[PDB]
Amino acid sequence: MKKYTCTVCGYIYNPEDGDPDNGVNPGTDFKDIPDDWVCPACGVGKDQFEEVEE
Ligand SMILES: [Fe+2]
DSSP states (O other), X not given: OOOEEETTTOOEEOTTTOBGGGTBOXXXXXXXXXXXXXXXXXXXXXXXXXXXXX
């Protein structure tokens, strides 16, 4: 799974860690995160994130 970054603030979503305090368990691919989740650092929608190509 690839990491995704919030293109508004720079936060990085790492699938190995998830975002558990907001219901995203470690091991969740970004596309499977429920679509109403927002960036935990600035609050913008998932549509402002982009795949980080390794
Ligand atoms: Fe953000």
